[PDB]
Amino acid sequence: MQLTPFLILLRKTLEQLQEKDTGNIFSEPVPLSEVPDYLDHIKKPMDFFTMKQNLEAYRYLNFDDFEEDFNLIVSNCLKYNAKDTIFYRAAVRLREQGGAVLRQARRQAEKM
Numbered sequence: 045m046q047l048t049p050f051l052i053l054l055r056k057t058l059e060q061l062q063e064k065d066t067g068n069i070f071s072e073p074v075p076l077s078e079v080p081d082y083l084d085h086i087k088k089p090m091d092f093f094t095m096k097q098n099l100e101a102y103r104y105l106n107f108d109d110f111e112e113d114f115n116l117i118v119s120n121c122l123k124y125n126a127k128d129t130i131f132y133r134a135a136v137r138l139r140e141q142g143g144a145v146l147r148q149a150r151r152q153a154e155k156m
């Protein structure tokens with residue numbers, strides 16, 4: 045399949061995922077200066093800005109590459125934050141709502 049339509053699709057999909065994160069809690073890396081124990085629990089931080097950089101660096105060449113980093117955003121947040129927090133529930137909401145975005149986008153990629 046052709047590269048350019050695939051990257052256009054991933055850009056649109058990433059924008060749709062960011063729209064689901066209405067608090068923008070996943071827009072940029074977790075600020076390690078404020079959370080010095082974060083790396084004690086989380087081996088690979090991820091966020092939507094880093095995903096955009098990876099996309100434009102041609103690091104995502106199949107849908108799994110892209111969805112893996114999305115899943116890291118969600119799983120890191122569930123792991124680090126207590127269940128009774130807004131942050132934890134925001135990851136649950138993103139998993140549910142972003143999952144639906146991802147399933148339709150993957151289907152578009154399969155038509156290529």
Ligand SMILES: CC(=O)c1c[nH]c2c(C)cccc12
Pocket residue numbers: 069070074075078079120121124125131
């Ligand atoms: C997504 C996430 O876990 C966080 C985003 N910002 C945070 C902050 C500021 C502290 C702890 C966790 C987070």
